[PDB]
Swiss-Prot record, chain B:
Functional summary from the UniProt entry: Required for thylakoid formation.
Signal peptide bounds: none
Gene designation per UniProt: vipp1
Family: Belongs to the PspA/Vipp/IM30 family.
Residues annotated as transmembrane: none
Subcellular localization(s) per the UniProt record: Cell inner membrane
Biological source species: Synechocystis sp. (strain ATCC 27184 / PCC 6803 / Kazusa)
Protein name: Membrane-associated protein Vipp1
Disruption phenotype: Essential, it cannot be completely disrupted. Cells with very low levels of protein have no ordered thylakoids, are barely green and are non-photosynthetic.
Portion of the full-length sequence here: 24 to 71 of 267
Amino acid sequence: RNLAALEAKISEAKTKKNMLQARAKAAKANAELQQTLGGLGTSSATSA
Amino acid sequence: DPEKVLEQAVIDMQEDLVQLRQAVARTIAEEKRTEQRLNQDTQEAKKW
């Protein structure tokens, strides 16, 4: 019983952390789009 | 000096469009990856 439970616990702990990591990484990637767009061309090129 | 700056600003823009193309392609991977999962996953429910 301890093992069968522990195996399920391990299995989901790993899987949840992985898919969380994946969605966290994807989320910051989407945020990095907004940041790089916030890296607007409305810049010192005008000053040149 | 003008020509240096005006061309440089344009040069920067050529990088930027490639960076956002990467992010698009990355997003295409996210959709592909989730499709791959969800499609199989829904069958796994049936299997059990």
